[PDB]
């Protein structure tokens, strides 16, 4: 039986932006979690609803792998019941999450001396995101009274802002790569169990 492709998730060359996060469904495979047990001691591993030591004897219908790049001090927001601009207008996790979250610093890969302007987040949004909702949309945000008619200016703002990663920043403003494994369980043949 095929193995679960956990290597192609953590070891990919490019990660997405947080406002346009990536998703990968994993099904019909044997899940060897030793990959997570052998992780180097600079990763950040947490689990919710299930003990890490007992992933090798549970069965799930689906596993979701969500990957993105955030700032150093915003990894605290990738958790159930959190508030802030990343948790509100970029990426939201339910209250009863039931899954694991892994994060690691990627300064050697995503920083540039001239500044990396390819990583962006959403700064202006009128209301919070529902859990696992993605908002890829570039429309002028009116913070004023008169309509904007799709033109920048006073009270008319481009919604997205840029990280601009540089090697000389403090560790809390350095890039971090984040993977979220969501364990799904419904009334189904339970494809992803794995010895």
């Amino acid at each position: 039986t095929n193995l679960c492709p956990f290597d192609e998730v953590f070891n990919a060359t490019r990660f997405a932006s947080v406002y346009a996060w990536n998703r990968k469904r994993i099904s019909n495979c044997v899940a060897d979690y030793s990959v997570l047990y052998n992780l180097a001691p600079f990763f950040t591993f947490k689990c919710y609803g299930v003990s890490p030591t007992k992933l090798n004897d549970l069965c799930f219908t689906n596993v979701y792998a969500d990957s993105f790049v955030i700032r150093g001090d915003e990894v605290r927001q990738i958790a159930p019941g959190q508030t802030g601009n990343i948790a509100d207008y970029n990426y939201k996790l339910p209250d009863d999450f039931t899954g694991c979250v892994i994060a690691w610093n990627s300064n050697k890969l995503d920083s540039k001396v001239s500044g990396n302007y390819n990583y962006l987040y959403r700064l202006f949004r009128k209301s919070n995101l529902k859990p696992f909702e993605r908002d890829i949309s570039t429309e002028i945000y009116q913070a004023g009274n008169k309509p904007c008619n799709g033109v920048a200016g006073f009270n008319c703002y481009f919604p997205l802002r840029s990280y601009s990663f540089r090697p000389t920043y403090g560790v809390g403003h350095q890039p971090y790569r984040v993977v979220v494994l969501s364990f799904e369980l419904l009334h189904a043949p339970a494809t992803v169990c794995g010895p």
Partner: antibody, heavy 117, light 108 residues
């Protein structure tokens, strides 16, 4: 033509309650970051609390539990409810429109609050 | 949790000079930092944002530059309406931090 008027400050005793109200014109308060900043007499600016456009609220460590920022869309007004007052809350108070990484561009004019018996 | 410190506190100048004010950060906060002006009695006014960009309606005398932990504001020519108190302000996720301020005044 873009303006932030304030009202609601005065004398109060150490332990009472008082609600400051900030009026807005040309700015929808439910679609901006709105901030309360106080300046004590001759000491300098200090952040109090912020309410996000989606409704999240954050407070300084000095006013946790004691203060509550709120927003009224129907009248387009910002509010700060103050309770368990101490003598260190005597200051001028400002409501500001914050743009994040573009600073605070629109300020109110100032409300004076004195907390003494 | 960032603490910002402004180096001059009561620095004076004369009409026609230049002047330089500095803000240190204690951890390293990228390049997001704003500079405000306040005349006595009135509300503060915005001058610079993102540490180098100029605000609409502001003259071109005011310049700013810096990064990481060191930022600098500079006035190239004192003019009889430029004597006020200036602050540096910061950001980053549920804390807003100001500096003590830097009074500027006539020299005699």
């Amino acid at each position: 033509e873009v303006q932030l008027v304030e009202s609601g400050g005065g004398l109060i005793q150490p332990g009472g309650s008082l609600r400051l109200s900030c009026a807005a014109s040309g700015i929808i308060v439910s679609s901006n970051y709105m901030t309360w900043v106080r300046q004590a007499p001759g000491k300098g600016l200090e952040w109090v609390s912020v309410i996000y456009s989606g409704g999240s609220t954050f407070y300084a460590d000095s006013v946790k539990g004691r203060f509550t920022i709120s927003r009224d869309n129907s009248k387009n007004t910002l509010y700060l409810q103050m309770s368990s007052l101490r003598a260190e809350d005597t200051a001028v108070y400002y409501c500001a429109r914050d743009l994040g990484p573009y600073g605070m561009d629109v300020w109110g004019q100032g409300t004076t609050v004195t907390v003494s018996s | 949790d960032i603490q910002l410190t402004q180096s001059p506190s009561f620095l004076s100048a004369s009409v026609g000079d230049r002047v330089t004010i500095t803000c240190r950060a204690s951890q390293g906060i990228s390049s997001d930092l704003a500079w405000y002006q306040q005349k006595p009695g009135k509300a503060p006014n915005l001058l610079i944002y993102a540490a180098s960009t100029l605000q609409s309606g502001v003259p071109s005398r005011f310049s700013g530059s810096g990064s990481g932990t060191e930022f600098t504001l500079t006035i190239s020519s004192l003019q009889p309406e430029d004597f006020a108190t200036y602050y540096c302000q910061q950001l980053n996720s549920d804390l807003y931090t100001f500096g003590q301020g830097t009074k500027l005044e006539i020299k005699r």
